[PDB]
Amino acid sequence: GSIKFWDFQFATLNQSFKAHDADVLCLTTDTDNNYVFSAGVDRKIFQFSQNTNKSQKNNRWVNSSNRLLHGNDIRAICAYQSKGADFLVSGGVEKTLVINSLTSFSNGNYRKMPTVEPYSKNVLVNKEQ
Amino acid sequence: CTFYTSLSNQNQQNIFTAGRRRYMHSWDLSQTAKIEKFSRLYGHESTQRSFEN
Amino acid sequence: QVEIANILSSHLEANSTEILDDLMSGSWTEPEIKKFILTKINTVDHLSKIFLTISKSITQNPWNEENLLPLWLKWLLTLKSGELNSIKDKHTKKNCKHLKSALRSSEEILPVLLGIQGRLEMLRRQAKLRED
Amino acid sequence: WHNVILSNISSNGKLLAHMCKDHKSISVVSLFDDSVNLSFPLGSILSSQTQSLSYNTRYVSSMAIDNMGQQLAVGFASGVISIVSLADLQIRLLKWHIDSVLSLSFSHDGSYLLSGGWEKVMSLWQLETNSQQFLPRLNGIIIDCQVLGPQGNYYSLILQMTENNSNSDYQFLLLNASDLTSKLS
Amino acid sequence: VKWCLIIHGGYLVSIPNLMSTLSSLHSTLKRRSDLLPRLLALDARLDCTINKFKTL
Amino acid sequence: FITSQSTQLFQLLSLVLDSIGLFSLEGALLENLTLYIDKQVEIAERNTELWNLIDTLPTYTMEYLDI
Amino acid sequence: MRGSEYQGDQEHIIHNDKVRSQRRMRAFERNINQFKWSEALDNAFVPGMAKELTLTVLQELRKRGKVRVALYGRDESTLEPLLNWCLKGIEDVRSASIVADWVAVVLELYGNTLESSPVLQELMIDLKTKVRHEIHKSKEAQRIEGMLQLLT
Amino acid sequence: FWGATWISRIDFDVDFPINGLTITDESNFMNHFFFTDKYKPLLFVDLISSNELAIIERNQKAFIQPKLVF
RNA sequence: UGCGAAAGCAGUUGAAGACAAGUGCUUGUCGUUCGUUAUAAAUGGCCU
C-alpha cells in the first residue's frame, strides 16, 4: 500500500507514503508531472501533488486527497490532457468505467459509465413465435 | 551513551543512553534525576525496532 | 356474519352512532374480525372511525367482561399498525393517550392479583387437607 | 475590520487571520509590517461537495495561521480540516475527527499541526507524510491547543469536561512534548 | 415448597424470625417476580410479529 | 361487595385475607372469591398485552406503461 | 553478556519506569476498544464462550448505545447465532432482561426479513414457547410470594 | 428509440414546439412524444405485438470500507 | 416547558427580515431580530 518516490540519478528514496490499505495496482501522472494518481485494491484513488512553487523548488510531494468512487478493485488507470480535455479514466473489477478531471480531481464532478452499452446487440426477439 | 550540550545554550547539558529496546532515555543535567524516555516514532515504528545504535 | 359485516360497512359510511352496537354483536368470531379488517378496511377514514369508537369504549370501562371489543383492538393494532400511525389527527393521539392510561393501571394491578391468587390457593388446599 | 466572525494570531504573534461577512471571506494581515496582505472568499476554499451537503460542512469552528503565512488551517463543524497554501490557494484535506474540531495550532516550523475536538484525543498531524500521533483519554474535550517553547518543549491545552452541564469546568494542562506527560495540570 | 407452607403454616407463624431464616426463599422468589413486567412486554412483541407472518 | 384505584381496593382486600387468617376463611365463600380473582387476572393479562401493543426482484413482471 | 543479573544494589540512584505487564485482552475486548461493534457481537456467540463473558459484551454494547448499530448488516445466516443464545439466555434470571432488549430490536429491525425467511420463523415459535414458559415461572414465583406474606 | 438507460417514442407527423467530462470538440470529428428512464439498464427493447413491448434488463467480494452509522 | 414519584398530570412548538436554489411565484436555510414557561450522512474511531 505504499507509494515511494525515488531519485533516478542516485537510485535512492526521496519520499515514502503509506496511503492505501492494500495493493496499489496502478499509477499515472499528468503531463507536467504536477500530480501522481494511485489506485488499487482498497477502491480509493489517491492524489499526490507537487504543484506549489515551494514544493517544486524543494522537490517534495504532498498527499493532497483521496476519493472512493469504485465498488471494487481498480486494476487500470490512465490520464489524458489537451487544450480541450482533462481525463482521469479508471476501471476495474466493477466492470464499469469512471471518468474524473485531473486538474479538479478533488472537487470536480465524475461520471460512472453504464456497465453495458449495447452498441452491438446480443439479444433479438421474433414477433412471430 | 553520550553527553550532549546545546550548541547555542551552553548551560544545557544532557545524557542520552540507549539499548536493545524500543525506547531511549535522556538525563538532563542531586536529590533526584530528571529522566525522560523517548519511545514514540510518529508512524515509523516499523522501520525502527531498537534505539541501540 | 355477512349481514353484520355489510351493515357495519354502511354505518361507517353513514357516520352512524350504531357502530359500537355492531362491533359488540356476538356473531363476530375470531377469524372473521381478521377478514373484515384485512378486506373491508381499505380507507383511512374507516380505520380511524373504528379505532376511535373502540378506543373510547375501552377507556370508559377497561374491566368489561366482554372480550370482543379488546379483540377488535388487538387485531386492529396487529394488522394495521402502519396505517394507524399514518393518521396524524391530534384527537387520535389524545385518545391513544387516554387508552394507554386506562390500560396502564391494569398492568400495575396484576402482581397484586397474583399474590392474592397465591394465598387463596393455599387456603383451598388447607381446607381440603382438613376435610381428609 | 468589520463583522469579524472568527480570528486567530500566529504563534510568533506577528500575523492575524480573520473571517468576515463582507457568504464570508478570509483575510490575513501582518501586524507590525506591510509584508503580508491577503484576502479571498471562503467559497474558493470550500469544496463543491460541501456546497451540496448540510451547513455543518461549510461552518468553520477553528482557524490557524502559520508563522510564515504560507499555510492556513481551517476546521469545520463536520470534523474536516483543510490546509490552504496562501501562495496559490491550493487545498489539502485532513479528515480524522468525526465531530466538530475545536482547536488547531501549527508548530513553529509549520511541519506539524496540533488538532483537538470532542474526541478527547489530541492529534499531532505530521504534514510531511500526512501521518498522525495520538494522545487519547484526555480529561476533557480540547478547547485550545498551542506549542509553547523556542523548540516546542511544551504543549499547552485547555480542557472542558463537558459532563458538567451546570458550569464550564476548564482545566489547563501543560504537557512535556518529549514524552507527552503532564508537566503541570 | 408449596406443601411445606401449606402443612406447617401454623408452625411457621409461631417462629421468632422468618426473613433471616428464609432469606434464600425471599431472594429467589423476588428475582423471578421482578422479571414479570419485562417478560410480558417481550411476549406482546413476539405475539405481534408472529401473528403478522402467519396470517401472511 | 368485591365479588359483585380498584387496586387500592384489591390491595385492601389482600390485607383483609391476611387479617382473617387461615382458619377463619370458609370454603364456600372462598370458591366465589377464587372465581372472581381468576377473572380479574385474565382481564389484567389482557389489558397488559394491549398496553404493550399501544407502546409498540422478480425475473419476469408484466406491467402497463403510462404514455 | 554479564550485567543482566545486577540490580543496582551499590548505585546512588535507581530509576524504574517499566510498566507492569497487563493481562492479555480477549478478542471481544479488542474489538470494542477498536470500535468494531459488529465483530464484537460475533465474538460473543462463539463455541466454548463463557456464559457470563457473553453477557458482558452484550451489556457493554448496550451501555455504549450500540445495539442497532451492531445489528444492521445482518441476515438470517448471521442472526441465528444471536437467536440461539437468546433461546437459552432467556431462561436465566441474570440474562433475561438483556435478552428482551436485544430480541425487541431485532424484531423491530428485521420484520420484513422474518416473513421471507422460514428458518428464522421457527426461532420465534420456539422462543415464543420459552418466554411463555418463563412467564409461568415468574407468575408462579409471585404466588409463593403472596402466600409467604400471609404466613408472616 | 432506446438507449442504454432510456426509451423514447417520436411521432414524425407532428412538429415539436419551437419555443465537462468530454472533449469540448472545438476540433473537428475528422481530419406525440413519450420519454421514460424508469427502465434501466436495457440490453434490448422491441415489440412482440402491436400492444406488447419487450424490455430486457440486467439483473464478487470487495475490500470492506465501512460506513459510519451512529 | 411547569408540577410531581420514578409513574404520570397540564401545556407549547409563533411572526418578521435576509440569503441560496428552481421556475414576479415555489421550496430550503440562517456565527439576524421580536415573542412564548416552552434524523444524521466530506470513507470520517482513541499512541508507544
Curated annotation (Swiss-Prot), chain B:
It comes from the Eukaryota. It is found in: Nucleus, Nucleolus. WD repeats lie at residues 1-30. Belongs to the WD repeat UTP18 family. Present with 9570 molecules/cell in log phase SD medium. Interacts with snoRNA U3. Interacts with MPP10, UTP21 and UTP25. Component of the ribosomal small subunit (SSU) processome composed of at least 40 protein subunits and snoRNA U3. Involved in nucleolar processing of pre-18S ribosomal RNA and ribosome assembly. This is U3 small nucleolar RNA-associated protein 18. The chain holds residues 298 to 357 of 594 of the full protein.
Curated annotation (Swiss-Prot), chain D:
It comes from the Eukaryota. It is found in: Nucleus, Nucleolus. WD repeats lie at residues 96-135. Present with 6560 molecules/cell in log phase SD medium. Interacts with snoRNA U3. Interacts with MPP10. Component of the ribosomal small subunit (SSU) processome composed of at least 40 protein subunits and snoRNA U3. In the absence of snoRNA3, forms a complex with other t-UTPs. This complex can associate with pre-18S ribosomal RNAs. Involved in nucleolar processing of pre-18S ribosomal RNA. Required for optimal pre-ribosomal RNA transcription by RNA polymerase I together with a subset of U3 proteins required for transcription (t-UTPs). This is NET1-associated nuclear protein 1. The lineage of its organism: Eukaryota, Fungi, Dikarya, Ascomycota, Saccharomycotina.
Swiss-Prot record, chain E:
It comes from the Eukaryota. It is found in: Nucleus, Nucleolus. Interacts with snoRNA U3. Interacts with MPP10. Component of the ribosomal small subunit (SSU) processome composed of at least 40 protein subunits and snoRNA U3. In the absence of snoRNA3, forms a complex with other t-UTPs. This complex can associate with pre-18S ribosomal RNAs. Involved in nucleolar processing of pre-18S ribosomal RNA. Required for optimal pre-ribosomal RNA transcription by RNA polymerase I together with a subset of U3 proteins required for transcription (t-UTPs). Present with 33100 molecules/cell in log phase SD medium. Belongs to the UTP5 family. This is U3 small nucleolar RNA-associated protein 5. It comes from Saccharomyces cerevisiae (strain ATCC 204508 / S288c) (Baker's yeast). The gene is UTP5.
Swiss-Prot record, chain F:
It comes from the Eukaryota. Coiled coil: none annotated. Signal peptide: none annotated. It is found in: Nucleus, Nucleolus. Present with 16800 molecules/cell in log phase SD medium. Interacts with snoRNA U3. Interacts with MPP10 and UTP25. Component of the ribosomal small subunit (SSU) processome composed of at least 40 protein subunits and snoRNA U3. In the absence of snoRNA3, forms a complex with other t-UTPs. This complex can associate with pre-18S ribosomal RNAs. Involved in nucleolar processing of pre-18S ribosomal RNA. Also has a role in nuclear tRNA export. It acts between the steps of tRNA maturation/aminoacylation and its subsequent translocation out of the nucleus. Required for optimal pre-ribosomal RNA transcription by RNA polymerase I together with a subset of U3 proteins required for transcription (t-UTPs). This is U3 small nucleolar RNA-associated protein 8.
